[PDB]
Design a protein around this ligand. Structure first.
Ligand SMILES: O=C(O)[C@H]1NC(=O)[C@H](O)[C@@H](O)[C@@H]1O
Ligand SMILES: O=C(O)[C@H]1NC(=O)[C@H](O)[C@@H](O)[C@@H]1O
Lengths: 596, 596
């Protein structure tokens, strides 16, 4: 469908992101048979929402649970809600959610990281209390996005195995809410912003107003109307603009009005006037070459598996700001929209990424990745859908300068191309206004990768000197430089190293500057930087990883992934100061001149 | 002011605690002078509420700030709230708040741990946006609770000094809510439980109807009316008992119905039928011997400081339950009421405490602690006032067994007894239903301590082996026993050890089992246990602290305070398993055989 972001004015929100909900596991999978949504959840403990369910109770068995869990909550419809359009929305429900308003199934969703909502007007009475039961599923398979394989052992007990390097946290990770609109309501806006050598431009609009004529006005930061439009559908605005720019992100405001004969609806959409374009080996923003700095991030913290939190967001952005990061990539799933609102407001450049990681069977059972058994026509449709829902969500955020379709598919087999070519094309139809990318795994190098020509920007995840040439900066450096030059000459695209990093145990110090030591982390990033500055095609550097985060258990992960610049409690490792010096020492948004 | 916990029936609330407010420091103390409240705060930045302002920005200069900070936020008033009573409520604003609604000063408060509310109907228009501005002050002085001294440097800036161990986190710590009520409504209730030998017994209501009559029906957990009164001012209700017990904590519900010609206000309260009193050396729960287990705790966590957080609350309770805690004390300030509903609902026992800590000058410039210079009549009032507001809030929470009037005052100076006798008086009258205490410091020991006799239960914070007899279990054991026995003689009052603990560095291990080693914590906690058991008078153990927590900087505090059984990120130290084993190897609410 269509997704607008709930704002208040004529339209109003009840939070119900009030956190305390009833919660129980459904170990027997009785829940649907017995219609638990029909009465109060039995044997139910208190849980916080928004939040992962896994870590809230410090219990291994709830953490490692695979299958169905139930959230239940009673809530009060505002009396004043009367005959307005009432909508129940979930910003996210991890992997799968099915929702009941009082023994009435109102919605269903597969996707752990984007919103789903249903008009509930007919199913609720204003001034009365309703029971809300969500059945949440955390299972992955070959058609889920990201993919996985549940293994049931001989006892019929499920266990989730998956192919990506973060932990499969689940639950209601983001805001759930009740919200209002008039029976005439704006429900889709699409803004495209053009700029022409930065003295003037046009901002096209496209508007869907469920039964309403629309009018448009564009306002300053200091709230004065600078352009108007009728053409309630397709209306183009000309301006002497304050451009939304990486440093500051100046935001205009577009007010969308849906008028019925008796009814009004008012939707304000923040707009940054900026162009994004690749020209040759450059990534241009408002027609200037940009240089990315900053991180691949995760949504991860102690006690919240991936649950959204405002303090964590305020804090992490103070860190990213302090360190001189100008960008990030929503590694491995769409992030909370609050994050993109922040980025828009603060002029943070973002690479927006679907949840399509784990397409790889060689990261470290089926023998063909592209297979009817394993990655197939159904998967591709699920993949396209994931792309659709992400673009439908994030299309108007000026902070998003690029779409990332997938992280680290195995592109060696013939068929990778078969599978990805249509997604690349589809994606571009969905959004013509942004470069497109597919993040690239180390072993699909310049000579073996089959897919990268189909996208606009080259985003490489590189670990030379870590997973390969381990401990050896000297030969690490040679392989890295040779690889990046090969890519440059092969594709003549802008290259962003979207991942480079080494596990570092905070407090592990070594005179020998060897693996897993603060000093090795320092020397290794430093060597990588030396190379980047020698390669003109390199247009960006995003360190892996903002902070330590949880993964599945194994021999390769010491209590988790330790490639953070900060620890999970947001303590700086000495590499944090190193990056601070490089990033705050550069000219903003500008690439070093390959010397101090 | 009259104080009721807002809840949703015919009554509605919108949390403005939706987190992102605009924030600013007023370093130049211009804020009040320039009516900053009249316009958008400039030089503003985003901050999350509910949370301490100190640690959200990873900035030392903000963390150590003393003076006024400004919080601002705009909020659309809901359309269905139009001739209703609207109340603006802050559950806590740490130290001091001054609130404006569009250039209309609406409220002021001293005390960082209790709610304050005002009707804003006249200053706000329904369906319109109003601007909310708050002035938050963190400064402490002799009149304040807890006290402090603020020094203005030779350069001109302010630095805070204070005498309690934990860190001075300030800002809007708990939720802010807009709040609805009919023009005729309830703003007060009080309930008492009598239970004689667990046969059927009574609950006396006393209520305040702001212009209405009340029907007052008591419902069982099944909403089955088991008693009724119409005397809106004084009643009694009697049925086969069904005790609120510490094991499971069963609750009843009391609908408070308040009637006017046009409007009815239904207010709901939760009631736990239980009895608390001392007979000689025993704390009796429903006329039966209780033995406390669990912790002294703080409100402290990684990036929010003392800011409330549901996930943290869910998680901490999981851990206390797991470890066998049945009780805790709201250390050195009153906690978020959410914590008390949890304890009410899960049947946890709570020693409730005021913010009155740091009366002492010997813990580690004025000559006389109780004097015009230090602690005076004015200070005794605020102490009184703080005690008023606490009981006003928590009087109805069944989980509260006892008031702690203060933590660790120095009672050796002249006038200590004069100071505490009248406050003891005023409190006994304010709640006759619950016993009353004052938590005692090591150096005011049995022979030296005045003012132990005015309280019903002896609450002792003891550190032998750690501050004295440093590292010496053998002598510390004797001093402790002789001490505890010397306490049974002077008084035959129930003894609870409210604090016993040792700093311990997670990961510090020693074959020598010496100070600041995981082993020592175990050995020492073990030692207090052997002694504890031998003393018939000892009614309880509350370990200091539950988890590591921040303190102001100094040579005695390494991370901050390290006496936590868990680290600040909630990871167990080996002593978590020691306590686990004792506290679950017990019979519930009972004392060990002074042997196995
Ligand atoms: O193994 C790593 O340290 C990282 N490398 C990668 O190439 C992946 O894109 C990341 O998910 C992963 O966390
Ligand atoms: O110094 C301590 O280990 C603790 N002992 C005490 O007696 C105080 O009550 C606490 O605030 C303090 O943190």
């Amino acid at each position: 469908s269509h997704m607008l972001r709930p704002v208040e004015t004529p339209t109003r929100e009840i939070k119900k992101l009030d956190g305390l909900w009833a919660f129980s596991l459904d170990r027997e999978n009785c829940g649907i048979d017995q219609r638990w949504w029909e009465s109060a959840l039995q044997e139910s403990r208190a849980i916080a929402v928004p939040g992962s369910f896994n870590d809230q109770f410090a219990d291994a068995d709830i953490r490692n649970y695979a299958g169905n869990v139930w959230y239940q909550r009673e809530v009060f419809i505002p009396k004043g809600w009367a005959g307005q359009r009432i909508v129940l929305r979930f910003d996210a429900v991890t992997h799968y959610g099915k929702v009941w308003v009082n023994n009435q199934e109102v919605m269903e969703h597969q996707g752990g990281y984007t919103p789903f909502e249903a008009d509930v007007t007919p199913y609720v009475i204003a001034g009365k209390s309703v029971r809300i039961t969500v059945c949440v599923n955390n299972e992955l398979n070959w058609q889920t996005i990201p993919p996985g394989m549940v293994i049931t052992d001989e006892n019929g007990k499920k266990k989730q195995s998956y192919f990506h390097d973060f932990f499969n946290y689940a639950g209601i990770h983001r805001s759930v809410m009740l919200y209002t609109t008039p029976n005439t309501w704006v429900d889709d806006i699409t803004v495209v912003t053009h700029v022409a050598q930065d003295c003037n431009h046009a901002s096209v609009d496209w508007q869907v107003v469920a039964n309403g004529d629309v009018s448009v006005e564009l306002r300053d930061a200091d709230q004065q109307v600078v352009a108007t439009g009728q053409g309630t559908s397709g209306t183009l605005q000309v301006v002497n603009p304050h451009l939304w720019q990486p440093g500051e992100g100046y935001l205009y405001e577009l007010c969308v009005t849906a008028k019925s004969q008796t009814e009004c609806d008012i939707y304000p959409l923040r707009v940054g006037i900026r162009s994004v374009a690749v020209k040759g080996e450059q990534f241009l923003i408002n027609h200037k070459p940009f240089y990315f700095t900053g991180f691949g991030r995760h949504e991860d913290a102690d006690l919240r598996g991936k649950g959204f939190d405002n303090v964590l967001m305020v804090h992490d952005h103070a860190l990213m700001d302090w360190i001189g990061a100008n960008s990030y990539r929503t590694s491995h799933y769409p992030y909370a929209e609050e994050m993109l609102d922040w980025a828009d407001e603060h002029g943070i450049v973002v690479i927006d990424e679907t949840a399509a990681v784990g397409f790889n069977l060689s990261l470290g059972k089926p023998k063909e990745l592209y297979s009817e058994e394993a990655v197939n026509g159904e998967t591709q449709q699920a993949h396209l859908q994931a792309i659709k829902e992400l673009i439908a969500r994030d299309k108007n955020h000026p902070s998003v300068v690029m779409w990332s379709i997938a992280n680290e598919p195995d592109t060696r087999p013939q068929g990778a191309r078969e599978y990805f070519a249509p997604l690349a094309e589809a994606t571009r139809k969905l959004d013509p206004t942004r470069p497109i990318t597919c993040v690239n795994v180390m072993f699909c190098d310049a000579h073996t990768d089959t897919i990268s020509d189909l996208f606009d920007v080259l985003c490489l995840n590189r670990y030379y000197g870590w997973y390969v040439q381990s401990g050896d900066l000297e030969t690490a450096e040679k392989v890295l430089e040779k690889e990046l030059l090969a890519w440059q000459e092969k594709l003549h695209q802008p290259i962003i190293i979207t991942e480079y990093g080494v596990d570092t145990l905070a407090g592990l110090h070594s005179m020998y500057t060897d693996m897993w030591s603060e000093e090795y982390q320092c020397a290794w990033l430093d060597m990588y930087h030396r190379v980047f500055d020698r390669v003109s095609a390199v247009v960006g550097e995003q360190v892996w990883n903002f902070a330590d985060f949880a993964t599945s258990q194994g021999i390769l992960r010491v209590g988790g992934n330790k490639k953070g610049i900060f620890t999970r409690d947001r303590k700086p490792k000495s590499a944090a100061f190193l990056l601070q010096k490089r990033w705050t020492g550069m000219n903003f948004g500008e690439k070093p001149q390959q010397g101090g």
